[PDB]
């Protein structure tokens, strides 16, 4: 038979499942909705582990339970009463013999120890992967240290001592590869000559590599705390989503820099060389699976100032037209081909973050926080699972590092790029459009000629890498 | 066969803009949504007795990717310019969205509707007369919508399709 | 994209977590933090086919020994890990092999025998002895180092191939 449980009057987590407290989706069960007590019971269930559920819950729970209350509830879950001696035990004791305690031993082995260990696993994941709760609430951290540091008894001892050390390490807080990275490539600008660095003087291969390292680092720094609750759209977004916003602002700045490089090159022949060079950078982005970089270029080519430069794009070689067209087609039909390509490539990659943001926001806005059933309000957990499926996908692509060497000077050049200067956005984008009208006027105005601005060779070194001994 | 209309929703972030398309496309009578599902943004409708397909682009949440707006806007034949009736700044942003649409489409006469969205019970700060006057100065319709009751949602999209049809 | 459920099992301290984190993050963990249960995902192209690995990293400490049926039911394939400088961990392999066979009620479960910590000079389990055991199970034997990455991809991706052909 099943183990008997403590009375639900002394231990709240022994109440029977009913549709008034938990609803399952239609081989472990999947929870659609439940009370917080039932969610925590299943989070730490005696019959099975659910590591996905632990991540989902710890990522999303603040939309229905405060951190202080979560800690109180899992401490309550941990403190399980042991059953009293059975009739057979009583009779042994009355005869001066040692009882067999079969039911007590089974309940310890099959209920208490698994539930308690799974509570500790929640604590461990909470500290390791969601430590911001404790950074933001020092008293919460004190309570967790006190709880862990006072767990008695030898069955939990290895994990209690470990979690204590992990907490202390987190309070005061290296990559190996299957090969060597390729050699850094140089073109007109030579190492150390940062004053000459520019779109056409750096090697296009190395531009794409160093931007990919920068954009990968920016992608990898975004934590789920910046996403859940749609906080990057709200009034406190600079406080709650700083790494996400830094990543987006880099993308925007590079797109505008590409546009500015194009329209400030007034000579037609030189501007063709600029656009051709940016398409070569796009080709290397594609080879590196840097989809953020691919779309940075595509967005620049489709901007109002650049898109209308028919005389420029007429001279672009047919093969480069095809590269740009294929990249543009990634975004068509609501990113259909992009989504398929991302799911087929071999990482490392840099995803485009914008699709994730729209899907998290619409999932939050389009589903209710609670489901009403039999007069009760149940937490709508399916909605939180959908959000955590998106944050889980994001995290999966954050794991794999690029095997490329940093060039500190080129990295600094792109970190300090500031195409808008001190200008506001409208003033700057109006400037770019007015430059576009100057260099290729609207028909029927004649096309003017403009003097060259570059004193160095415009011929590209190409984007196939070289390898000396 | 039937005509497909490519509609684009534009407007300030953080003030409930996404509720418009969600409430339209939704199972009208079950409050649920998975935006990741292939064609959670396509809907076959009958407008003035003529069946058509709406393809709605709503990039809500991507507002900080400001240099992508041109690319997204160029996909559209008609535009819903959305502000929140309790956020004056989102209303003041409308002029620049409209100017940007005209530039991207290279036309002074782009089908569009002005939508005032009631996203919560916070106090209204943009009166309907202010928004009607702005819409009239542009020569476009004005529709008010509720983000909670679905009121006005069909009217906003169907009015835009009629603007496209009568362009 | 085909999804594969991999489970890493073996005695405490043999390097199951270090092997998994080296595969996932290209990083070697120096600390010994005993696992309760952890799970990881990895998209990777193997033999020209993209798939999604779900990797369950399990508890080796004996205090968790009564909680294994639940993860053995879900796993498709198992990395059975011992450390080549720990003879007791090698003797513990057969207990994991037998439990997996019982729970899945099958003599034909995809498995790979993994001898970890092969970067260390002071070996106590000879390759021949582990290879003999692997042959008796009908499975390959791969020596690994979570520290240097030697053998790590080979071990996990060999297990994927055995699930794929199962
Ligand atoms: C890559 C390409 C493809 C086709 C062409 C053509 C022929 C084509 N039937 C055409 O008349 N395209 C008109 C609009 C597009 N514009 C080029 C362009 C500017 N920014 C972009 C962003 C993304 C894409 Cl995909 C294209 C562009 C040229 C004029 C001439 N040049 C081409 C270059
Ligand atoms: N030299 C060397 N040390 C290793 C290797 N793999 C793991 N270790 C070390 O061995 C210790 C235990 O590693 P760990 O991965 O935690 O083992 P585990 O099998 O996951 N333990 P548990 O079953 O308790 O979760 C750590 O100190 C780790 O750095 C290896 O290949 N070489
Ligand atoms: Mg471990
Ligand atoms: Na206001």
Q: What's the CATH code of the domain at A101?
A: 1.20.870.10
Q: Is A302 in the pocket of ligand 1 (CB under 6 A)?
A: yes
- In-domain check, residue A133: yes
Q: Total domain count for chain A?
A: 2
Tokens at A39, concatenated:
């969610």
Tokens at A361, concatenated:
């926001």
DSSP 8-class letter at C63? G
Query: CB of B111 within 8 A of CB of B162?
Result: no
CA distance A62 to A77: 19
Three-state SS string across B38-55, please?
Answer: CCCCEEEEEECCEEEEEE
- In-domain check, residue A82: yes
CA distance A57 to A242: 23
**Cis omega (within 30 of 0) for bond into A348:** yes
- In-domain check, residue A111: yes
Same domain? For A340 and A360 the reply is: no
**Cis omega (within 30 of 0) for bond into A444:** yes
CA distance A126 to A262: 49
Q: Is A318 in the pocket of ligand 1 (CB under 6 A)?
A: no
CA distance A335 to A354: 11
Residues 205-244 of A with CB under 8 A from B: 230, 232-235, 237
Ligand 2 binding pocket mutation candidate from C10, C12, C18 (most atoms within 8 A of CB)? C18
Distance, CA C145 to ligand 2 centroid (Å)?
A: 10
CA distance A163 to C36: 11
Q: Is A327 in the pocket of ligand 1 (CB under 6 A)?
A: no
Q: Are B64 and A235 a contacting pair at CB < 8 A? A: no
SS3 for A155?
helix
Q: Give the DSSP per-residue string, C129-161.
A: HHHHHHHHHT--EEE--TTT-TTHHHHHHHHHH
- Rounded to the nearest 10 degrees, the angle between the axes of helix A113-129 and helix A51-60 is 50
Residue of A252, A255, A361 with shortest CB distance to B60: A361
Q: Is C164 on the interface with A (CB under 8 A)?
A: no
Same domain? For A387 and A420 the reply is: no
What is the experimental method?
Answer: X-ray
- In-domain check, residue A204: yes
Place of tokens 């690994």: C144
Q: Strands B42-47, A376-380: parallel, antiparallel or unpaired by DSSP? A: unpaired
Structural domain range at position A127: 4-171+354-396
CA distance A156 to A162: 10
Same domain? For A64 and A205 the reply is: no
In degrees and rounded to multiples of 5, residue B113 shows phi and psi of -130, 145
SS3 for B115?
strand
Query: CB of A53 within 8 A of CB of A43?
Result: yes
Distance, CA A313 to ligand 1 centroid (Å)?
A: 7
Residue B133 annotated as binding?
no
CA A233 to chain centre: 16
Q: Which of A219, A196, A323, A211 is nearest to A258 (CA)?
A: A211
Mutation for B interface: A291, A351, A357, most B CBs within 10 A: A357
Q: Is A361 on the interface with B (CB under 8 A)?
A: yes
CA distance A465 to A468: 10
CA distance C71 to C56: 8
For A119, counting Cβ atoms within 10 Å of its Cβ (0-12 exposed, 13-18 middle, 19+ buried), the class is: buried
Same domain? For A199 and A347 the reply is: yes
> For this experimental structure, what is the resolution in angstroms?
1.8
CA distance B30 to A382: 15
CA distance C80 to A399: 24
- In-domain check, residue A331: yes
Kind plus residue range of the DSSP H or E element containing B4: strand B3-11
Residue where a domain stops, chosen among A366, A396, A426: A396
Same domain? For A332 and A433 the reply is: yes
CA distance A262 to B58: 29
Distance, CA B89 to ligand 4 centroid (Å)?
A: 6
Q: Give the DSSP per-residue string, B132-147.
A: HHHHHHHT--EEEEET
CA distance A218 to A220: 6
Tokens at A200, concatenated:
């056409």
Alpha-carbon separation of residue A433 from A58, A312, B119 (angstroms): 47, 15, 35
CA distance A300 to A262: 9
Kind plus residue range of the DSSP H or E element containing A3: none
Same domain? For A286 and A418 the reply is: yes
In degrees and rounded to multiples of 5, residue A107 shows phi and psi of -65, -40
Cβ atoms within 10 A of the Cβ of A422, count?
Answer: 7
Place of tokens 């819903």: B80
Distance, CA C34 to ligand 1 centroid (Å)?
A: 58
Three-state SS string across A299-339, please?
Answer: HHHCCHHHHCCHHHHHCCCHHHHHHHHHHHHHHHHHHHHHH
In degrees and rounded to multiples of 5, residue A350 shows phi and psi of -120, 105
- In-domain check, residue A176: no
Residue C118 annotated as binding?
yes
Residue where a domain stops, chosen among A365, A396, A427: A396
For A248, counting Cβ atoms within 10 Å of its Cβ (0-12 exposed, 13-18 middle, 19+ buried), the class is: buried
Alpha-carbon separation of residue A306 from A109, A263, B3, B137 (angstroms): 70, 7, 31, 31
Task: Give the length of chain C.
Answer: 166
- Rounded to the nearest 10 degrees, the angle between the axes of helix A138-149 and helix A67-78 is 10
Q: Whose CA is nearest to atom 4 of ligand 1?
A: A321
Query: CB of C52 within 8 A of CB of A345?
Result: no
Same domain? For A158 and A186 the reply is: no
Q: Which of B126, B114, B107, B106 is nearest to B159 (CA)?
A: B114
Same domain? For A347 and A360 the reply is: no
Mutation for A interface: C30, C43, C144, C145, most A CBs within 10 A: C43
- In-domain check, residue A93: yes
Could you tell me the sign of the dihedral formed by the alpha carbons of A221, A223, A228, A231, in that order? Answer: negative
Provide the shortest C-alpha distance from residue A254 to chain B (in Å).
Answer: 9
Same domain? For A158 and A206 the reply is: no
Q: What is the domain-level CATH number for residue A241?
A: 1.10.840.10
Same domain? For A29 and A80 the reply is: yes
Q: Which of A71, A168, A86 is nearest to A122 (CA)?
A: A71
- In-domain check, residue A177: no
Same domain? For A422 and A340 the reply is: yes
Residue B14 annotated as binding?
yes
Residue B109 annotated as binding?
no
Residue of C43, C67, C74 with shortest CB distance to A396: C43
Residue where a domain stops, chosen among A396, A418, A452: A396
Residues 97-116 of C with CB under 8 A from A: none
Place of tokens 């037609």: A268
Contacts of residue A199, defined as CB under 8 A and 6 or more positions apart, other chains included, come to A207, A261, A274, A277, A278
Q: Is A186 in the pocket of ligand 1 (CB under 6 A)?
A: no
Task: Calculate ∠ Cα A266-A456-A434, nearest 5°.
Answer: 15
Q: Is A321 in the pocket of ligand 1 (CB under 6 A)?
A: yes
| Among the bound ligands, the one closest to the CA of A328 | 1
Task: Give the length of chain A.
Answer: 469
- Which domains occur in chain C, in start order? 1-166 (3.40.50.300)
Query: CB of B30 within 8 A of CB of A215?
Result: no
Query: CB of A130 within 8 A of CB of A58?
Result: yes
Taking the C-alpha atoms of A17, A18, A20 and A25 in order, what is their torsion angle to the nearest 10 degrees? 90
Q: Is C38 on the interface with A (CB under 8 A)?
A: yes
CA distance A298 to A285: 11
Alpha-carbon separation of residue A83 from A6, A16, A101, A267 (angstroms): 7, 18, 10, 88
Cross-strand bridge partners of residue C49: C46
Task: From the CA of C12, give the closest atom in ligand 2.
Answer: 23
CA C49 to chain centre: 22
Q: Strands B112-118, B142-146: parallel, antiparallel or unpaired by DSSP? A: parallel
Q: Which of A315, A287, A285, A289 is nearest to A300 (CA)?
A: A285
Q: Is B35 on the interface with A (CB under 8 A)?
A: yes
Cβ atoms within 10 A of the Cβ of A109, count?
Answer: 14
In degrees and rounded to multiples of 5, residue B152 shows phi and psi of 80, -10
Cβ atoms within 10 A of the Cβ of C118, count?
Answer: 21
Query: CB of A389 within 8 A of CB of A396?
Result: no
- Number of helices and strands in chain B (H, E): 6, 6
Query: CB of A122 within 8 A of CB of A58?
Result: yes
Same domain? For A75 and A224 the reply is: no
Residue of A303, A386, A426 with shortest CB distance to B70: A303
């Amino acid at each position: 038979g099943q183990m008997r449980l403590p009375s639900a009057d002394v231990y709240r987590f022994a109440e029977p499942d009913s549709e008034e407290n938990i609803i399952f989706e239609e081989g472990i069960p999947i929870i659609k909705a439940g009370t917080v007590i039932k969610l925590i019971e299943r989070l730490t269930y005696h019959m099975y582990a659910d590591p996905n559920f632990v991540r989902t819950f710890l990522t999303t729970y603040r939309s229905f339970c405060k951190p202080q209350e979560l800690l109180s509830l899992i401490i309550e879950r941990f403190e399980i009463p042991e059953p009293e001696p059975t009739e057979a035990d009583r009779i042994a004791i009355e005869n001066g013999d040692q009882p067999l305690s079969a039911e007590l031993k089974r309940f310890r082995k099959e209920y208490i120890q698994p539930v308690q260990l799974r509570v500790l696993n929640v604590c461990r994941h909470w500290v390791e992967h969601h430590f911001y709760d404790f950074e933001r609430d020092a008293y919460l951290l004190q309570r967790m240290e006190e709880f862990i540091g006072t767990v008695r008894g030898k069955a939990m001892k290895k994990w209690v001592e470990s979690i204590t050390k992990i907490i202390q390490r987190k309070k005061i807080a290296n990559i190996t590869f299957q090969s060597s990275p390729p050699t850094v490539e140089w073109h007109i600008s030579r190492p150390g000559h940062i004053e000459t660095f520019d779109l056409l003087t750096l090697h296009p291969i190395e531009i794409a590599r160093q931007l990919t390292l920068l954009e990968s680092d920016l992608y990898r720094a975004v934590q789920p705390s910046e996403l859940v609750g749609s906080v990057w759209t709200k009034e406190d977004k600079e406080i709650n989503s700083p790494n996400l916003l830094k990543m987006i602002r880099h993308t925007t700045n590079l797109t505008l820099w590409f546009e500015k490089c194009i329209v400030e090159t007034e000579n037609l022949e030189e501007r063709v060389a600029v656009v051709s060079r940016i398409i070569e950078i796009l080709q290397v982005f594609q080879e590196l699976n840097n989809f953020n970089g691919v779309l940075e270029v595509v967005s620049a080519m489709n901007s109002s100032p650049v898109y209308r430069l028919d005389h420029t794009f007429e001279q672009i070689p047919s093969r480069q037209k095809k590269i740009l067209e294929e990249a543009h087609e990634l975004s068509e039909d609501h990113y259909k081909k992009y989504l398929a390509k991302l799911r087929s490539i071999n990482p490392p990659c840099v995803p485009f973050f914008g699709i994730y943001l729209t899907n998290i926001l619409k999932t939050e806005e389009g589903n209710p926080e609670v489901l009403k059933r039999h007069g009760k309000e149940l937490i709508n957990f399916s909605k939180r699972r959908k959000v955590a499926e998106i944050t889980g996908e994001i995290q999966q692509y954050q794991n794999q590092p690029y095997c490329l060497r940093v060039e500190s000077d080129i990295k600094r050049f792109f970190e300090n790029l500031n195409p808008m200067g001190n200008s506001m956005e409208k003033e700057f984008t109006d400037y770019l459009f007015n430059k576009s009208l100057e260099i290729e006027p609207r028909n029927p105005k004649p096309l003017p000629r403009f003097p060259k601005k570059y004193s160095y060779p415009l011929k590209s070194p190409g984007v196939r890498p070289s390898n000396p001994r | 066969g039937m005509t497909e209309y490519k509609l684009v929703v534009v407007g300030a972030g953080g003030v409930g803009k996404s509720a418009l398309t969600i409430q339209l496309i939704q199972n009208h009578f079950v409050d649920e949504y998975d935006p990741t599902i292939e064609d959670s943004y396509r809907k076959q409708v009958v407008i003035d007795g003529e069946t058509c397909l709406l393809d709605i682009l709503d990039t809500a949440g991507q507002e900080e990717y400001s240099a992508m707006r041109d690319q997204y806007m160029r996909t559209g034949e008609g535009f819903l310019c959305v502000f929140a009736i309790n956020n004056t700044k989102s209303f003041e942003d409308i002029h620049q969205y409209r100017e940007q649409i005209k530039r991207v489409k290279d036309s002074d006469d782009v089908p569009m509707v002005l939508v005032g969205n009631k996203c919560d019970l916070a106090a209204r700060t943009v009166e309907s007369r202010q928004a009607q006057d702005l819409a009239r100065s542009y020569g476009i319709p004005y529709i008010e919508t509720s983000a909670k009751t679905r009121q006005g949602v069909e009217d906003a999209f169907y009015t835009l399709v009629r603007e496209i049809r009568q362009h």
